Amino acid sequence: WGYGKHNGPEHWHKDFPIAKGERQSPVDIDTHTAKYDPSLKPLSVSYDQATSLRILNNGHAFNVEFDDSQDKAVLKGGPLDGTYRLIQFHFHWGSLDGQGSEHTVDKKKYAAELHLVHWNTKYGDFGKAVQQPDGLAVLGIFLKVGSAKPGLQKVVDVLDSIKTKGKSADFTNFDPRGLLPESLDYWTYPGSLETPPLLECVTWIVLKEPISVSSEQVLKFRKLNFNGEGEPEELMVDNWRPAQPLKNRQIKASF
Template sequence: MHIVCMKDGLSPDSAAKQEDGYAVLGFFINAKDDQDTSEAWTTLTSFLPNIKEVDQMVNADQNISINGLIGNVDLSKYYRYMGSLTTPQCSEAVVWTLFHEPIPVNSTLIQMFPLMTSFVDIYRPTQDLNGRQVYTSASSVPSHSWCYEGHLCDYAPSNWSFLPEAKCGGEQQSPINIDTQSTTEDESLGAFTFLNFDDKHVIESITNTGHSVQCNINGSVEVSGGGLPHVYTVLQFHFHWGSVASHGSEHLLDSKSFPMEMHIVCIRKDLNMSEALAHSDGLAVLGFFIEAPQTSKSGSHSSSTSDSSGTTTPPTSSTSDMEAWTKLTNYLDQIQTVNSQVPFSDEISIDDLLGNVDRHSYFRYNGSLTTPQCNEAVVWTVFKESIKVNQNLMTRFPESTGYENIYRPQQEQHSRTILSTKVSAGSSPQVKTARLFYPLLVFVWALLY
């Protein structure tokens, strides 16, 4: 069943000339022998004997509502793509919406359509996508088709490779353990250019996807440089976490994990999603470890060490804007239901969340998405220094959503090379101290000799 709608204010001719001039709602219909006869469908089919001839028309003088025909179909589950009318002139002017659940109708009523009209097989064959992207509402994907370890579903991480069309069994999968002693320094890994990371109005909404908390971006944020092969547009950022008492980062640093990890997901500016997933550099993901602030006895972070819980402490200090993280986590209670989404109205920039974390020091490797379909299409950047966030704010993620340990286990590195930025003079407190006292040492040497 097609419900054909025309853009308000247009004529049929002008609507046919615009790519979104029409919107068509498509509903599949299933024949059910044991289906109770629907009053709306019984009324509708009662008119069919009066229009047996072509171009015959009869007034619908009985009450029939569209809602009555649709019944209890879940209208939150649908697919969306840009297409055309399915009859000549086949104008490519339609925003298509196809609903996932079919309308169940008694088979006797369905049989009346060909019997009364005397024509059958009235459908156009399927057409090629030709690179178009088919989108899905979050709720149209079964929420338990895949899950993380310890969650109830058919496909845990060890079985992701058996999912239809999944690439999760490849040899360039993510996340991985980053062995810092085995990385290769690369001088081409320079500074990034972050466009609109300081804009406090780029977060449009926040969503509970059932697998994470995701913040959706309005499309004006870009990242380039940093050795990336293209300019990338930021789509969203999301989080991975453990439980209240354990670690949950996806990547490991020298086999050590962090309580959380933040992923900023970006797409090549010149590609759509289907094209990006087919290119090894179609996506770029910026990964940031997250942990609670920890200070040494002197009041500052020491060089990379491990605390009693096994968490790697980064070599330098960085503190994020706790006010921004407080505002962000205040939304968590509003999205406790899976697939729930709310508009984001607070003024928070991505820079506010990242704080003064060192964005010049990072690792780089080629990998995959860390959720199905696990496409090996990602240029990964994992920053060496972690974001510091109050522990109480971090625990709100598992407590509010009701699920924990949402991270994919470590994958094999295979023959991949992990690149690292060159160690700069300002990257460690020790080097900074040496540079500060060097002129004094020269002066003392001159006095003595």
């Protein structure tokens, strides 16, 4: 599976039949249809004690990994029940500034999209969590092109070392707090993993407020390779999945 003509999202259902399931992600967030839900509590992000370990190129994106052996970086509150630990964060971006985001707002597409992956500690590990309806919590953040993002530069400066599939680099002391918008206003709905195996185990939390990154920041992303070292170069671009059918589900707003 990949993001090309022959192995793109339109092909994933052949190996992962859930691809045409009832709670697939991403989706288009229709802001006039979204329901303001007064019973929605504020989001609770505790990342001051976060421990990053490494960054890797898995062939479809780059993952910044965190030590999830203790409740060091967690998300709670909002529409969530219990504590969710931060495991990794990654992005989805386009070939141009005009596309890249997975989720869309009133059909508007952003340059990229930041996903912070968290798992429900009631289930013991990530592996067990992907087997549950409430096993994951993904915090989605939109990126627009404008001014540079100080907090993202450390990520950008190490991409050169993990250019090809399989590469990894020690990456400690990185604070995720540098990637959050000022407002924590969000939209929430029940969905799924955006990549195979596309398990319908996610509680999506998409922030209203996007973060801005400079054109040169985003440019560095576009220089990665899908392919492994010593293979024809396939730039890592357009690694985003098209919006899926809402199918009855309801998107609620904390605002």
